[PDB]
Write an enzyme that holds these catalytic residues in place. Structure first.
Site, short mmCIF file in Angstrom:
data_model
loop_
_atom_site.label_atom_id
_atom_site.label_comp_id
_atom_site.label_asym_id
_atom_site.label_seq_id
_atom_site.Cartn_x
_atom_site.Cartn_y
_atom_site.Cartn_z
N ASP A 104 0.79 -1.22 0.00
CA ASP A 104 0.00 0.00 0.00
C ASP A 104 0.83 1.28 0.00
O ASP A 104 0.32 2.32 -0.44
CB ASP A 104 -0.97 0.02 1.19
CG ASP A 104 -0.29 -0.20 2.53
OD1 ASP A 104 0.96 -0.26 2.60
OD2 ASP A 104 -1.03 -0.32 3.53
N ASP B 51 4.80 2.02 13.53
CA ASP B 51 4.10 0.79 13.90
C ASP B 51 4.91 -0.15 14.80
O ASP B 51 4.37 -0.68 15.77
CB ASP B 51 3.66 0.01 12.65
CG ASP B 51 2.52 0.69 11.91
OD1 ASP B 51 1.72 1.40 12.56
OD2 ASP B 51 2.44 0.52 10.67
O1 LIG Z 1 -1.31 7.00 11.11
C1 LIG Z 1 -0.31 6.97 12.15
C2 LIG Z 1 -0.92 6.33 13.40
O2 LIG Z 1 -1.51 5.04 13.02
C3 LIG Z 1 -2.10 4.34 14.22
O3 LIG Z 1 -2.65 3.07 13.84
C4 LIG Z 1 -3.81 3.29 13.01
C5 LIG Z 1 -3.48 2.83 11.59
O4 LIG Z 1 -2.76 1.59 11.67
C6 LIG Z 1 -2.04 1.33 10.49
C7 LIG Z 1 -1.31 0.05 10.77
O5 LIG Z 1 -2.28 -0.87 11.39
C8 LIG Z 1 -1.66 -2.20 11.72
O6 LIG Z 1 -2.63 -3.01 12.23
C9 LIG Z 1 -3.32 -2.90 13.41
C10 LIG Z 1 -4.72 -2.35 13.39
O7 LIG Z 1 -4.67 -0.96 12.95
C11 LIG Z 1 -5.39 -2.40 14.71
O8 LIG Z 1 -6.77 -2.02 14.56
C12 LIG Z 1 -5.34 -3.80 15.30
O9 LIG Z 1 -5.91 -3.79 16.54
C13 LIG Z 1 -6.17 -4.85 17.38
C14 LIG Z 1 -5.22 -5.51 18.33
O10 LIG Z 1 -4.03 -5.95 17.61
C15 LIG Z 1 -5.82 -6.68 19.02
O11 LIG Z 1 -4.89 -7.19 20.00
C16 LIG Z 1 -7.13 -6.32 19.71
O12 LIG Z 1 -7.68 -7.45 20.23
O13 LIG Z 1 -8.10 -5.69 18.75
C17 LIG Z 1 -7.53 -4.54 18.03
C18 LIG Z 1 -8.50 -4.12 16.97
O14 LIG Z 1 -9.76 -3.92 17.55
O15 LIG Z 1 -3.93 -4.29 15.41
C19 LIG Z 1 -3.20 -4.25 14.13
C20 LIG Z 1 -1.76 -4.51 14.45
O16 LIG Z 1 -1.42 -3.63 15.49
C21 LIG Z 1 -0.04 -3.78 15.86
O17 LIG Z 1 0.90 -3.43 14.76
C22 LIG Z 1 0.93 -1.98 14.48
C23 LIG Z 1 1.24 -1.15 15.74
O18 LIG Z 1 1.09 0.23 15.42
C24 LIG Z 1 0.31 -1.48 16.87
O19 LIG Z 1 0.81 -0.85 18.08
C25 LIG Z 1 0.18 -2.94 17.12
O20 LIG Z 1 -0.98 -3.10 17.95
C26 LIG Z 1 -0.61 -4.04 18.97
O21 LIG Z 1 -0.82 -5.45 18.49
C27 LIG Z 1 -0.28 -6.36 19.50
C28 LIG Z 1 -0.37 -7.79 18.97
O22 LIG Z 1 0.75 -8.01 18.10
C29 LIG Z 1 -1.04 -6.20 20.82
O23 LIG Z 1 -2.41 -6.64 20.62
C30 LIG Z 1 -1.03 -4.77 21.29
O24 LIG Z 1 -1.93 -4.64 22.42
C31 LIG Z 1 -1.42 -3.80 20.23
O25 LIG Z 1 -1.15 -2.46 20.69
C32 LIG Z 1 -1.01 -2.83 10.50
O26 LIG Z 1 -0.30 -4.01 10.91
C33 LIG Z 1 -0.06 -1.90 9.82
O27 LIG Z 1 0.43 -2.50 8.59
C34 LIG Z 1 -0.68 -0.56 9.51
O28 LIG Z 1 0.34 0.32 9.02
O29 LIG Z 1 -4.71 2.71 10.73
C35 LIG Z 1 -5.73 1.84 11.36
C36 LIG Z 1 -6.12 2.37 12.75
O30 LIG Z 1 -7.01 1.43 13.37
C37 LIG Z 1 -4.93 2.55 13.64
O31 LIG Z 1 -5.35 3.28 14.82
C38 LIG Z 1 -1.07 4.15 15.31
O32 LIG Z 1 -1.73 3.61 16.48
C39 LIG Z 1 -0.39 5.42 15.68
O33 LIG Z 1 0.71 5.15 16.58
C40 LIG Z 1 0.15 6.16 14.49
O34 LIG Z 1 1.28 5.44 13.94
#
Ligand SMILES: OC[C@H]1O[C@@H](O[C@H]2[C@@H](OC[C@H]3O[C@@H](O[C@H]4[C@H](O)[C@@H](O)[C@H](O[C@H]5[C@H](O)[C@@H](O)[C@H](O)O[C@@H]5CO)O[C@@H]4CO[C@H]4OC[C@@H](O)[C@H](O)[C@H]4O[C@@H]4O[C@H](CO)[C@H](O)[C@H](O)[C@H]4O)[C@H](O)[C@@H](O)[C@@H]3O)OC[C@@H](O)[C@@H]2O)[C@H](O)[C@@H](O)[C@H]1O
Length: 696
Positions: A41, A410
């Site tokens: 993307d 991330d």
């Molecule tokens: O724009 C800058 C801003 O972006 C914020 O994030 C936003 C954007 O994210 C883009 C990236 O998303 C990555 O995927 C994650 C999903 O967005 C997220 O909704 C999802 O959430 C989960 C969670 O993982 C579950 O445990 C939980 O049960 O339910 C939730 C949903 O209801 O998790 C996806 C992966 O998240 C992890 O990788 C990316 C990191 O930024 C996260 O901190 C991290 O989250 C952790 O996951 C671990 C497990 O491995 C644990 O669960 C922790 O508790 C979590 O904190 C995707 O992989 C990327 O490719 C993509 O670029 O856009 C979507 C929007 O929802 C987000 O808010 C970000 O938070 C800010 O810091 C800025 O960087």
């Protein structure tokens, strides 16, 4: 042809980390074994290289002027011409965003013809993992169809050179297009086409039987959800459904089978809950072998289901529903960091058309591959050698300790003891998005970093191997900031310009913070002198004014120099950069305003007339002992956009890249104090790429 001026041949390679971003699609070529493409993307596209067991980036000729084309909304091959590949390119569809483009290649992505469109392409917006929206007619390859998210369906009859709106297709937000190749013979336009659109009222799936001239809603399709992706096999149209385009917020979904000849529908959903489906692959050599993937099944984790009887029974591959126990084996030896994530956003999964036991699927952090789907349980490998999609918001290269440290979007902070292997400890600081990192020049074991949850910062005293969070943060702080922290040369003083708070300084490793005096604007990218721990610099790109502290960050004063100004939205082109080993030696970038140099701690600055535009600058080991450090510049010199090195203090420049190694949007650039010629480049969605002079 561009003019090929003098340059030094360089070899550019990614720092090996592995994945890190959202891969949005995988395509096996059905008529050439070993030919596979992948789309992302924000990081362009890749081609698999079996000879070297790694992915090859094929879009690094994109540059600062067309970096939006790094968003690949769709990728398509021609079954009757194995050398062709097409890409639908663009990132956003908002009012401030430019139009997209179709890129066409006849050499498997080595070179591209760029066809700008009149429409905007949302390669980095919702639904980007749906598809494929771009398709080559499987019977007459000169015909292509293109589904867009804001401008309906477009058709080309000259292999993507020109595009005409299909006015008979009324919906404007298309999820995918799919041909039924059995509806025509070779050399004739394919007559049966299905299109899925973003609609949850039962009008998502449309059908044409006359090559796209007329369209009709497919009767009997499910309601409350939209068609996400489709596969055709043995007269069946297998479609995944969800109540959201994804990649997030799906709380309902199904998998249905549609008999093309009589219109009958059969629900073959493996399971139903508060989640949807998206990824699906029918075995190209066995219509009864199907894989589907859940979407947004966050707890316990997403599931992949496998059937060998056409959906009559399904076996869970990733975890057992009876007790939520993981059963699949995940090999992250290639990238130990990746084990902090679980497979999610599995919006694409594909079975190898030349080995039914091999498959791959995408996630929000890279590609996973299975080489024996028949194994019980299955083993999946993190197969992302050469595939680097991280956003290095800031990088530093200390003169001792690790070669490089990265603050990634991330995924956190990384410590790189080797450039050719992923860090053995994984992430060095597990805090998510990290926007800043700096090391103390005279004590490079002392490192500070910022991130985006309280207390928003942390520091290390052993070169980033161990960390501890700031005991406090400036009042009002809502985020760590971007390149917004600087630590004094002796490591005793920190100046921090976080989001939502005025720039502040600490004398006790973050245990307490005090607002900097003098009236300096907040939200600037602060720079520490590399020798004098009492000197800090902060450049205001909007006013074109340099601010200097001579009391260790307690207060700042505004220098009299009138630098070329920059609009607020282009403030990333303004920076101040201190030279290691040289107190008061700072370089100021002003974008199209050029490059300026001061050798008296900012009291006065002189324009570097050899440079036309300057976006980021770095410094490294000098070619000879006693010489000025090598200067590495990303900007424009004599009308040439690229990367340049000066060995004589900035009067003459040598280009150290070519037009095939621009890497899209470069965030910053650094040299290396230990190795002459070594250059570190942070590129949006392409990780860190390092360059060395090529041996003769
Ligand atoms: O724009 C800058 C801003 O972006 C914020 O994030 C936003 C954007 O994210 C883009 C990236 O998303 C990555 O995927 C994650 C999903 O967005 C997220 O909704 C999802 O959430 C989960 C969670 O993982 C579950 O445990 C939980 O049960 O339910 C939730 C949903 O209801 O998790 C996806 C992966 O998240 C992890 O990788 C990316 C990191 O930024 C996260 O901190 C991290 O989250 C952790 O996951 C671990 C497990 O491995 C644990 O669960 C922790 O508790 C979590 O904190 C995707 O992989 C990327 O490719 C993509 O670029 O856009 C979507 C929007 O929802 C987000 O808010 C970000 O938070 C800010 O810091 C800025 O960087």
């Amino acid at each position: 042809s561009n003019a090929m001026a003098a340059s030094e041949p360089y070899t550019w390679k990614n720092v090996v980390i592995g994945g890190g971003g959202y891969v949005t699609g995988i395509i096996y070529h059905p008529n050439q074994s070993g030919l596979v493409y992948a789309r992302t993307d924000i990081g362009g596209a890749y081609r698999w290289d079996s000879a070297t067991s790694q992915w090859i980036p094929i879009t690094d000729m994109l540059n600062r002027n067309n970096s939006d084309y790094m968003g690949i909304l769709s990728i398509a091959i021609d079954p009757n011409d194995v050398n062709r590949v097409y890409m639908l390119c663009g990132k956003y569809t908002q009012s401030w965003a430019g139009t997209g483009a179709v890129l066409a290649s006849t050499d498997k992505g080595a070179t591209w013809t760029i066809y700008p469109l009149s429409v905007k392409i949302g390669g980095n917006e919702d639904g980007r993992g749906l598809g494929e929206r771009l398709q080559v007619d499987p019977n007459l390859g000169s015909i292509l169809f293109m589904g867009t998210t804001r401008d309906g369906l477009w058709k080309s009859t000259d292999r993507g050179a020109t595009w005409v709106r299909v006015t008979s297709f009324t919906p404007t937000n298309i999820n995918f297009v799919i041909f039924d190749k059995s509806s025509s013979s070779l050399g004739q336009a394919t007559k049966r086409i299905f299109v899925g659109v973003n609609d949850t009222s039962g009008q998502s799936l449309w059908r044409s039987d006359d090559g796209g001239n007329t369209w009709k809603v497919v009767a009997g399709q499910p309601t409350g959800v939209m068609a996400m992706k489709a596969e055709i096999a043995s007269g069946y149209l297998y479609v995944t459904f969800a109540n959201s385009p994804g990649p997030n917020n799906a709380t309902a979904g199904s998998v249905w089978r549609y008999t093309i000849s009589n219109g009958e529908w059969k629900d073959i959903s493996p399971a139903k809950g508060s989640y949807g489906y998206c990824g699906i692959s029918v075995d190209p050599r066995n219509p009864n072998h199907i894989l589907v993937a859940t979407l947004d099944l966050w707890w316990p984790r997403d599931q992949i289901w496998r059937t060998t009887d056409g959906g009559s029974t399904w076996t869970p591959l990733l975890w057992n529903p009876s007790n939520n126990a993981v059963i699949a084996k995940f090999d992250t030896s290639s990238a130990p960091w990746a084990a902090i994530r679980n497979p999610h956003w599995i919006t694409d999964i594909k079975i190898d058309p030349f080995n039914s036991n091999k498959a791959m699927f995408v996630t929000g952090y890279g590609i996973w591959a299975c080489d024996n789907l028949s194994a019980s349980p299955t083993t999946w490998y993190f197969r992302n050698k050469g595939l680097e999609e991280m956003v290095p918001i800031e990088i530093v290269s200390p003169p001792s300790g690790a070669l490089l440290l990265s603050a990634m979007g991330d995924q956190g902070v990384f410590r790189h003891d080797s450039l050719d292997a992923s860090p053995s400890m994984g992430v060095a600081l597990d805090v998510g998005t990290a926007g800043s990192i700096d090391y103390a020049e005279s004590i490079p074991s002392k490192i500070v970093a910022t991130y985006y949850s309280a207390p928003y910062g942390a520091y290390s005293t052993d070169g980033g191997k161990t960390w501890t969070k700031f005991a406090s943060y400036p009042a009002g702080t809502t985020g760590g900031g971007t390149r917004a922290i600087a630590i004094s040369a002796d490591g005793n003083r920190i100046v921090w310009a976080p989001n939502g708070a005025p720039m502040s300084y600490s004398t006790n490793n973050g245990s307490s913070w005090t607002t900097c005096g003098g009236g300096v604007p907040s939200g600037l990218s602060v720079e520490a002198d590399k020798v004098n721990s009492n000197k800090f610099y902060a450049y205001d790109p909007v006013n074109g004014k340099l601010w200097v502290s001579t009391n260790g960050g307690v207060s700042f004063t505004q220098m009299s120099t009138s630098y070329p100004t920059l609009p607020s939205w282009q403030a990333y082109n303004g920076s101040v950069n201190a030279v290691f080993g040289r107190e008061g030696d700072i370089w100021i970038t002003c974008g199209a305003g050029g490059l300026y140099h001061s050798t008296n701690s900012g009291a006065s600055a002189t324009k570097v007339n050899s440079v036309q535009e300057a976006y980021s600058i770095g410094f490294g080991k000098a070619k000879t002992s006693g010489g000025y450090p090598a200067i590495y510049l990303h900007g424009i010199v004599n009308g040439v956009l690229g990367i340049f090195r000066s060995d004589d203090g900035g009067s003459t420049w040598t280009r150290i890249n070519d037009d095939n190694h621009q890497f899209g949007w470069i965030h910053m650039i650094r040299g290396d104090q230990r190795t002459y010629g070594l250059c570190y480049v942070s590129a949006e969605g392409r990780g860190v790429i390092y360059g060395l002079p090529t041996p003769t």
